[PDB]
């Protein structure tokens, strides 16, 4: 990229990772140490509404559970 706006674009991708595990276990924790994932701590936001949502749907749909 270069610049502009950001509409829940990163999360949509990030989540997928933590789901498929494509990303190491430590990397996740590091995400919080990054500014791009500031909403992480926040809850009354939109960017955070995905990481928690997209994850709930991505977690249930896919691997065995039930």
From Swiss-Prot:
Originating species: Homo sapiens (Human)
Subcellular localization: Nucleus
Role description: May play a role in mRNA splicing.
Top-level taxon of the source organism: Eukaryota
Ranges: SURP motif repeats: 11-54
Lineage of source species: Eukaryota, Metazoa, Chordata, Craniata, Vertebrata
Gene name in the database record: SUGP2
Protein name (database record): SURP and G-patch domain-containing protein 2
Tissue: Detected in adult testis, and in fetal brain and kidney.
Phosphoserine modification, residue list: 24
């Amino acid at each position: 990229g270069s610049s502009g706006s950001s509409g829940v674009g990163t999360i949509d991708q990030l989540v997928k990772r933590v789901i498929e595990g494509s990303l190491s276990p430590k990397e996740r924790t590091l995400l919080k140490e990054d500014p791009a994932y500031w909403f992480l701590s926040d809850e009354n936001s939109l960017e955070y509404k995905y990481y928690k949502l997209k994850l709930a749907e991505m977690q249930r749909s896919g691997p065995s559970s039930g």
